[PDB]
Amino acid sequence: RPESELIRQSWRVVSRSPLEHGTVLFARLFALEPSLLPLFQYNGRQFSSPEDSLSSPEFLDHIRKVMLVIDAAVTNVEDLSSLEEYLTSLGRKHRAVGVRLSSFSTVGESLLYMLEKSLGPDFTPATRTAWSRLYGAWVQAMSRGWDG
Numbered sequence: 001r002p003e004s005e006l007i008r009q010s011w012r013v014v015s016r017s018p019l020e021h022g023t024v025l026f027a028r029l030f031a032l033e034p035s036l037l038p039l040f041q042y043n044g045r046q047f048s049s050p051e052d053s054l055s056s057p058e059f060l061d062h063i064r065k066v067m068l069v070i071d072a073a074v075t076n077v078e079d080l081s082s083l084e085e086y087l088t089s090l091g092r093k094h095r096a097v098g099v100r101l102s103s104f105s106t107v108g109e110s111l112l113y114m115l116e117k118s119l120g121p122d123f124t125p126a127t128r129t130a131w132s133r134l135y136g137a138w139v140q141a142m143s144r145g146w147d148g
């Protein structure tokens with residue numbers, strides 16, 4: 001099925017410059033859910049305002065990490081069974097870190113916003129609903145980290 005090629009096609013534009021695009025992603029996220037900010041604790045300090053995050057090298061490395069894990073999920077768009085065991089542990093990591101299950105709908109909304117603003121004309125509704133089901137599956141797997 002070329003639902004998996006809508007994704008691969010949309011991703012190649014984005015994956016051209018991942019840090020620029022993942023910066024869009026996290027600016028949108030904090031605009032939607034300001035209380036996600038304090039969970040990025042590096043040397044036990046809390047950023048005051050969203051813009052403080054953009055000067056932090058650790059924060060920017062975490063962006064590069066987000067974009068590599070999305071890249072991996074793309075690279076396995078049919079058989080996301082490979083990544084399950086990893087995504088589960090990635091979930092549990094984020095549970096320890098303080099992330100709550102409800103914050104996934106926000107991360108999802110931010111991913112779509114970033115895709116939408118990046119592809120403009122090409123973000124067609126089949127593309128949206130593709131990313132939307134992929135993301136839903138990435139989410140099911142990550143959720144095992146909260147205990148099934």
Ligand code: HEM
Pocket residue numbers: 036039040041058061062065066067069070093094097099103107
């Ligand atoms: C939703 C808000 C998020 C918050 C608040 C958050 C916060 C954190 C924190 C505090 C860490 C540990 C310190 C660090 O490695 O930089 C971390 C690690 C990580 N995050 Fe996130 N994160 C979020 C979302 C995500 C998403 C969506 C992905 C991937 C799609 C992601 C991928 C990772 C990866 C790969 C690591 C490294 C984990 C390890 O191997 O130890 N994070 N995150």
Ligand SMILES: [Xe]
Pocket residue numbers: 023026027030050051053054
């Ligand atoms: Xe940001």
Ligand SMILES: [Xe]
Pocket residue numbers: 027050051
């Ligand atoms: Xe920001």
Ligand SMILES: [Xe]
Pocket residue numbers: 061
């Ligand atoms: Xe890293």
Ligand SMILES: [Xe]
Pocket residue numbers: 018019064065067068
């Ligand atoms: Xe990256």
Ligand SMILES: [Xe]
Pocket residue numbers: 015018067068071
């Ligand atoms: Xe990437």
Ligand SMILES: [Xe]
Pocket residue numbers: 094099107
């Ligand atoms: Xe997350």
Ligand SMILES: [Xe]
Pocket residue numbers: 070107111
């Ligand atoms: Xe994501």
Ligand SMILES: [Xe]
Pocket residue numbers: 070073134135138
């Ligand atoms: Xe994803």
